[PDB]
Amino acid sequence: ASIEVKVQQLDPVNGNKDVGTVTITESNYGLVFTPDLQGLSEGLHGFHIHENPSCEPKEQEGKLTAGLGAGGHWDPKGAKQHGYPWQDDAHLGDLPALTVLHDGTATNPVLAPRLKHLDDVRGHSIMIHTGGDNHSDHPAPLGGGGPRMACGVIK
């Protein structure tokens, strides 16, 4: 029971770059996401499972935008609302925020209690945003994650 996801920093122009991996394992309380990332900006970053198994950029109003190919937050139960990892009426893809230390590394594992089986995340993508995550659609949509900084396709 384990999936090692290769994660890359997104740059539609200069090119993407490997920043490490995120290993997903099953615990008695839900899926555990264990990062081993580097070269990221210090702080808390929005961390979610997105609908499409793609990290490719997509054209948006005449602008090749990073990670748009991944689609929106994975929401199989139609919550149509961004929320907490422990909130039942929030996107099923809403994970705890990722902590990146001063040295640009992330190794602190986080639990997603609503995700129970590894197979459930296969066929999707995992996204790391430039901004944080206040687990609400206010004052900013999707927790204020904003732009997509890094991404990995979940095989």
- Binding residues for Cu ion (CB under 5 A): 42, 48, 102, 127
| Residue number, 30 or 72, with CB nearest to Cu ion | 72
Kindly write out the interface string for residues 51-90 of this chain, putting x where it contacts Zn ion by CB under 5 A and - elsewhere.
----------------------x--------x--------
Comparing CA positions, the residue from 45, 151, 149, 144 lying closest to residue 100 is 45
17-24 contacts, C-beta under 8 A, 24 or more apart: 19/150, 20/106, 21/152, 22/126, 22/152, 24/118, 24/121, 24/154
Query: 127 contacts which partner out of Zn ion, a second copy, Cu ion, none, CB within 5 to 8 A by kind?
Result: Cu ion
Nearest approach in angstroms of CB 15 to Zn ion is: 28
Tokens found for residue 50:
């997105």
- Is 102 assigned a ligand-binding role in the annotation? no
Nearest approach in angstroms of CB 65 to a second copy is: 27
Cβ–Cβ < 8 Å for 51, 154: no
Binding status of residue 133 toward Zn ion by CB under 5 A = no
Give the ranges where the chain is alpha helix by DSSP (H): 118-121
Cα–Cα distance between 129 and 65 in angstroms, integer?
Answer: 13
Nearest approach in angstroms of CB 119 to a second copy is: 19
**51, 120, 128, 137 from 146: Cα distances, Å:** 17, 25, 10, 12
Nearest approach in angstroms of CB 79 to a second copy is: 14
- Is 48 assigned a ligand-binding role in the annotation? yes
Cα–Cα distance between 103 and 114 in angstroms, integer?
Answer: 31
| Residue number, 14 or 41, with CB nearest to a second copy | 41
- Is 135 assigned a ligand-binding role in the annotation? no
Binding residues for Zn(2+): 73, 82, 91, 94
Binding residues: 48, 50, 73, 82, 91, 94, 129
